[PDB]
Design a protein around this motif. Structure first.
Motif, PDB file in Angstrom:
ATOM      1  N   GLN A  32       0.857  -1.225   0.000  1.00 40.19           N
ATOM      2  CA  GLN A  32       0.000   0.000   0.000  1.00 40.19           C
ATOM      3  C   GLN A  32       0.879   1.256   0.000  1.00 40.19           C
ATOM      4  O   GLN A  32       0.785   2.099  -0.870  1.00 40.19           O
ATOM      5  N   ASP A  33       1.731   1.389   0.976  1.00 39.14           N
ATOM      6  CA  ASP A  33       2.622   2.587   1.045  1.00 39.14           C
ATOM      7  C   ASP A  33       3.973   2.246   0.409  1.00 39.14           C
ATOM      8  O   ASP A  33       4.902   3.029   0.424  1.00 39.14           O
ATOM      9  N   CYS A  34       4.090   1.073  -0.142  1.00 41.61           N
ATOM     10  CA  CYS A  34       5.379   0.665  -0.771  1.00 41.61           C
ATOM     11  C   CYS A  34       5.563   1.387  -2.112  1.00 41.61           C
ATOM     12  O   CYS A  34       4.720   2.140  -2.555  1.00 41.61           O
ATOM     13  N   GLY A  35       6.674   1.148  -2.751  1.00 37.62           N
ATOM     14  CA  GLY A  35       6.957   1.797  -4.065  1.00 37.62           C
ATOM     15  C   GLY A  35       8.452   2.121  -4.139  1.00 37.62           C
ATOM     16  O   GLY A  35       8.953   2.581  -5.147  1.00 37.62           O
ATOM     17  N   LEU A  36       9.164   1.892  -3.071  1.00 37.01           N
ATOM     18  CA  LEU A  36      10.626   2.194  -3.065  1.00 37.01           C
ATOM     19  C   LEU A  36      11.391   1.144  -3.872  1.00 37.01           C
ATOM     20  O   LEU A  36      10.944   0.020  -4.052  1.00 37.01           O
ATOM     21  N   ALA A  37      12.550   1.514  -4.364  1.00 39.30           N
ATOM     22  CA  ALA A  37      13.371   0.561  -5.166  1.00 39.30           C
ATOM     23  C   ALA A  37      14.732   0.392  -4.507  1.00 39.30           C
ATOM     24  O   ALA A  37      15.331   1.343  -4.024  1.00 39.30           O
ATOM     25  N   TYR A  38      15.224  -0.824  -4.479  1.00 38.71           N
ATOM     26  CA  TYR A  38      16.552  -1.101  -3.852  1.00 38.71           C
ATOM     27  C   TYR A  38      17.439  -1.864  -4.854  1.00 38.71           C
ATOM     28  O   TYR A  38      17.175  -3.020  -5.151  1.00 38.71           O
ATOM     29  N   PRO A  39      18.471  -1.237  -5.387  1.00 39.25           N
ATOM     30  CA  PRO A  39      19.385  -1.895  -6.362  1.00 39.25           C
ATOM     31  C   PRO A  39      20.393  -2.824  -5.672  1.00 39.25           C
ATOM     32  O   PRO A  39      20.689  -2.685  -4.502  1.00 39.25           O
ATOM     33  N   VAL A  40      20.916  -3.774  -6.392  1.00 40.40           N
ATOM     34  CA  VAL A  40      21.899  -4.720  -5.788  1.00 40.40           C
ATOM     35  C   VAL A  40      23.315  -4.191  -5.995  1.00 40.40           C
ATOM     36  O   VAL A  40      23.690  -3.798  -7.081  1.00 40.40           O
ATOM     37  N   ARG A  41      24.104  -4.183  -4.950  1.00 40.94           N
ATOM     38  CA  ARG A  41      25.511  -3.683  -5.058  1.00 40.94           C
ATOM     39  C   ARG A  41      26.479  -4.813  -4.726  1.00 40.94           C
ATOM     40  O   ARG A  41      26.391  -5.438  -3.691  1.00 40.94           O
ATOM     41  N   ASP A  42      27.402  -5.072  -5.608  1.00 45.90           N
ATOM     42  CA  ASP A  42      28.399  -6.158  -5.381  1.00 45.90           C
ATOM     43  C   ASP A  42      27.680  -7.490  -5.132  1.00 45.90           C
ATOM     44  O   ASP A  42      28.175  -8.368  -4.451  1.00 45.90           O
ATOM     45  N   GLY A  43      26.518  -7.648  -5.695  1.00 39.71           N
ATOM     46  CA  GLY A  43      25.765  -8.919  -5.509  1.00 39.71           C
ATOM     47  C   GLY A  43      25.035  -8.888  -4.170  1.00 39.71           C
ATOM     48  O   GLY A  43      24.434  -9.864  -3.767  1.00 39.71           O
ATOM     49  N   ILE A  44      25.081  -7.778  -3.475  1.00 36.20           N
ATOM     50  CA  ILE A  44      24.385  -7.687  -2.155  1.00 36.20           C
ATOM     51  C   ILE A  44      23.211  -6.693  -2.264  1.00 36.20           C
ATOM     52  O   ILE A  44      23.380  -5.594  -2.763  1.00 36.20           O
ATOM     53  N   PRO A  45      22.028  -7.063  -1.807  1.00 41.01           N
ATOM     54  CA  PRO A  45      20.830  -6.173  -1.865  1.00 41.01           C
ATOM     55  C   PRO A  45      20.897  -5.040  -0.836  1.00 41.01           C
ATOM     56  O   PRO A  45      21.541  -5.150   0.189  1.00 41.01           O
ATOM     57  N   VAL A  46      20.230  -3.950  -1.104  1.00 41.58           N
ATOM     58  CA  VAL A  46      20.244  -2.809  -0.146  1.00 41.58           C
ATOM     59  C   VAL A  46      18.955  -2.823   0.675  1.00 41.58           C
ATOM     60  O   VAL A  46      17.862  -2.772   0.146  1.00 41.58           O
ATOM     61  N   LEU A  47      19.084  -2.891   1.972  1.00 38.56           N
ATOM     62  CA  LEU A  47      17.888  -2.909   2.869  1.00 38.56           C
ATOM     63  C   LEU A  47      17.866  -1.618   3.683  1.00 38.56           C
ATOM     64  O   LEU A  47      17.249  -1.537   4.727  1.00 38.56           O
ATOM     65  N   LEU A  48      18.536  -0.599   3.210  1.00 43.66           N
ATOM     66  CA  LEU A  48      18.566   0.695   3.956  1.00 43.66           C
ATOM     67  C   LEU A  48      17.573   1.679   3.334  1.00 43.66           C
ATOM     68  O   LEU A  48      17.551   1.921   2.139  1.00 43.66           O
ATOM     69  N   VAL A  49      16.746   2.248   4.157  1.00 41.67           N
ATOM     70  CA  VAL A  49      15.738   3.220   3.665  1.00 41.67           C
ATOM     71  C   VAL A  49      16.444   4.453   3.095  1.00 41.67           C
ATOM     72  O   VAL A  49      16.064   4.987   2.072  1.00 41.67           O
ATOM     73  N   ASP A  50      17.459   4.918   3.764  1.00 40.82           N
ATOM     74  CA  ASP A  50      18.187   6.128   3.282  1.00 40.82           C
ATOM     75  C   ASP A  50      18.811   5.843   1.909  1.00 40.82           C
ATOM     76  O   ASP A  50      18.853   6.692   1.042  1.00 40.82           O
ATOM     77  N   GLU A  51      19.307   4.660   1.705  1.00 40.85           N
ATOM     78  CA  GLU A  51      19.933   4.336   0.393  1.00 40.85           C
ATOM     79  C   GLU A  51      18.840   3.914  -0.596  1.00 40.85           C
ATOM     80  O   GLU A  51      19.076   3.762  -1.779  1.00 40.85           O
ATOM     81  N   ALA A  52      17.643   3.724  -0.117  1.00 40.86           N
ATOM     82  CA  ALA A  52      16.533   3.308  -1.024  1.00 40.86           C
ATOM     83  C   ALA A  52      16.350   4.336  -2.138  1.00 40.86           C
ATOM     84  O   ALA A  52      16.528   5.524  -1.943  1.00 40.86           O
ATOM     85  N   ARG A  53      15.996   3.881  -3.315  1.00 35.50           N
ATOM     86  CA  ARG A  53      15.804   4.814  -4.466  1.00 35.50           C
ATOM     87  C   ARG A  53      14.323   4.964  -4.770  1.00 35.50           C
ATOM     88  O   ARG A  53      13.532   4.046  -4.597  1.00 35.50           O
TER      89      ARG A  53
END
Ligand SMILES: [Zn+2]
Length: 56
Positions: A32-53
């Motif tokens: 519902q309130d989702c829509g953020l995007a998180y790219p993978v870096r060095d094969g590792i996913p980003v779970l940080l809201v601040d780094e979220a795109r």
């Protein structure tokens, strides 16, 4: 006073607990309130809201 787990196999966003959709080498938040995007870096996913795109 053990920490809650509820199967670590459950998919849930970092803070905006909600369904997640994997796309190529990036993860998209779904819900519902989702829509953020998180790219993978060095094969590792980003779970940080601040780094979220935000949506392109
Ligand atoms: Zn989310």
């Amino acid at each position: 006073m053990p920490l809650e787990a509820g199967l670590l196999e459950i998919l849930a966003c970092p803070a905006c607990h909600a369904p997640l959709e994997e796309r190529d080498a990036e993860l998209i938040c779904t819900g519902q309130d989702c829509g953020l995007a998180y790219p993978v870096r060095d094969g590792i996913p980003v779970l940080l809201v601040d780094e979220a795109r935000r949506p392109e």
